[PDB]
Amino acid sequence: QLNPGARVKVTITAPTGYKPIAGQKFVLEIKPKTGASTIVTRTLSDGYNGGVII
Amino acid sequence: FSGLEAAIVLIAFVVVAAVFSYVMLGAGFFATQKSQEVTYSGMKQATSNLILDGMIYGSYSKGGSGLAQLYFYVKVPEGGETQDLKYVTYLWTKENKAVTTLTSITPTNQQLNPGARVKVTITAPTGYKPIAGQKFVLEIKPKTGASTIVTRTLSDGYNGGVII
Amino acid sequence: IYGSYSKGGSGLAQLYFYVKVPEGGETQDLKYVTYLWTKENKAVTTLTSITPTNQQLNPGARVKVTITAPTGYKPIAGQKFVLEIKPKTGASTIVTRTLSDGYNGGVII
């Protein structure tokens, strides 16, 4: 659980077919129970040996 | 007239409010999360720029058709974003001919970390090999970045080598 | 913006310019992009003959668009032309150029 005004490191592993590669955009919809649902779309620069997604 | 029924409605006013509230937040996060993406891409658009580094050398043949190979280093600014040459396209011209995009490049498949360089080798297509005194242009078009152009004219002279 | 040009011909014939989408942009359909054209303050005519007539661009990609100016509108050296690029659902550009009086062809500076 998260008390309000706290954070946690979420770690996602993409399923076998869905692992995105450099230059391929992915979307992640975060759906808390009883709450507004976000979405964060990113596209890996074609580049990106890893690390921060700008 | 009883407030009992007013309650029935008061639910409805609250519920549609909560639903609108619910969606507007969702509409809003997406608004924000979109507003973030364009910004990240926006900086990435400017900073992903790629650059020709230093002189443009070339191989040349008198008995051949002309300038054949062309050598120019290409780099990324130290503060730049990493690149993929696979997606960089090299447009070419010989003396106000039409354009043809250019097929045969040595680093066909490699990446550049920002603040690094590579020796690009262009071979001009059959008709477009420039000869001494004929200007050529080379537009270097990194994916997602400012596109350069380097125009040169071979001095009428030039058995080969550095293009001044 | 590059172009093919002919002295003995009427003038600038083909025109070549790459068109792209920003990396953060939305994908596009060139089938629905319309290219409006002008030769030296003539009226407008929308432009029919384009090489990529039917293809899409993923955002953060490009394509070589090839315009042929209609019979009357082929510009000649020293004559300015405008090209308005109008993607469906998006901000519409315009690129005005004037061929230097000169220009046997090639790149339009």
Side-chain angles (χ1 to χ4, degrees):
Chain A
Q1 297 181 221
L2 269 54
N3 301 132
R7 69 167 68 84
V8 63
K9 187 183 139 174
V10 178
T11 298
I12 302 304
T13 322
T16 63
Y18 286 75
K19 293 187 178 73
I21 189 170
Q24 294 194 338
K25 72 177 179 295
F26 64 76
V27 302
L28 163 72
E29 206 176 13
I30 299 173
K31 283 184 167 292
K33 178 182 73 59
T34 306
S37 298
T38 106
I39 172 170
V40 292
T41 176
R42 299 284 190 268
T43 176
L44 307 188
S45 70
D46 207 352
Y48 192 88
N49 194 359
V52 199
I53 299 167
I54 300 94
Chain B
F1 245 82
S2 175
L4 174 158
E5 307 108 23
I8 307 298
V9 183
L10 195 146
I11 303 162
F13 291 1
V14 168
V15 174
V16 56
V19 177
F20 171 65
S21 293
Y22 175 87
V23 175
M24 172 169 173
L25 289 168
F29 299 180
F30 176 55
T32 306
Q33 292 302 333
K34 188 68 178 179
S35 178
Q36 244 191 157
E37 178 64 11
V38 295
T39 302
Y40 297 145
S41 70
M43 286 177 256
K44 188 175 298 196
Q45 191 61 250
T47 62
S48 296
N49 58 336
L50 161 146
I51 284 168
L52 176 134
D53 175 66
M55 303 305 96
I56 304 192
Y57 304 76
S59 178
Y60 181 104
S61 189
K62 295 292 287 183
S65 295
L67 175 77
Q69 309 296 322
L70 185 80
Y71 316 138
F72 58 97
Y73 282 72
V74 168
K75 73 169 290 180
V76 185
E78 183 63 31
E81 294 303 325
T82 178
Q83 215 70 255
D84 52 336
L85 311 187
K86 202 232 296 286
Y87 289 61
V88 172
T89 68
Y90 307 96
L91 323 187
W92 181 266
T93 304
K94 174 177 73 70
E95 188 183 6
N96 71 49
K97 275 179 69 176
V99 169
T100 182
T101 172
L102 284 162
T103 313
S104 294
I105 68 178
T106 293
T108 192
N109 183 26
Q110 179 175 11
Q111 297 181 220
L112 269 55
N113 301 132
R117 69 168 68 85
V118 63
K119 187 183 139 174
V120 178
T121 298
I122 301 305
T123 322
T126 63
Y128 286 75
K129 293 187 177 73
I131 190 170
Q134 294 193 339
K135 72 176 179 296
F136 63 76
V137 302
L138 163 71
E139 206 176 13
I140 299 173
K141 283 184 167 292
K143 178 182 73 60
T144 306
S147 298
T148 106
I149 173 170
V150 293
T151 175
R152 298 284 190 269
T153 176
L154 307 188
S155 71
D156 207 351
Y158 192 88
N159 194 359
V162 200
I163 299 167
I164 300 95
Chain C
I1 304 191
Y2 303 77
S4 177
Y5 181 103
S6 189
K7 296 291 287 182
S10 295
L12 175 77
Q14 309 295 323
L15 185 80
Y16 315 138
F17 58 97
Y18 282 71
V19 169
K20 72 169 290 180
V21 186
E23 183 64 30
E26 295 302 326
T27 177
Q28 215 69 256
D29 52 336
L30 310 188
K31 202 231 297 286
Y32 289 60
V33 172
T34 68
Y35 307 96
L36 323 187
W37 181 266
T38 304
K39 173 177 73 70
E40 188 183 6
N41 71 49
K42 276 180 69 177
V44 169
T45 182
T46 172
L47 284 163
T48 313
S49 293
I50 68 178
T51 293
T53 192
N54 182 27
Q55 179 175 12
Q56 297 181 220
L57 268 55
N58 302 132
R62 69 168 68 85
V63 63
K64 188 183 139 174
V65 178
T66 298
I67 302 304
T68 322
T71 62
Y73 286 76
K74 293 187 178 73
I76 189 170
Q79 295 193 339
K80 71 177 179 296
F81 63 76
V82 302
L83 163 71
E84 206 176 13
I85 300 173
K86 282 184 167 292
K88 178 182 73 60
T89 305
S92 298
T93 106
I94 173 170
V95 292
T96 175
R97 298 285 190 268
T98 175
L99 307 188
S100 71
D101 207 352
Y103 192 88
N104 194 359
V107 199
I108 299 167
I109 300 94

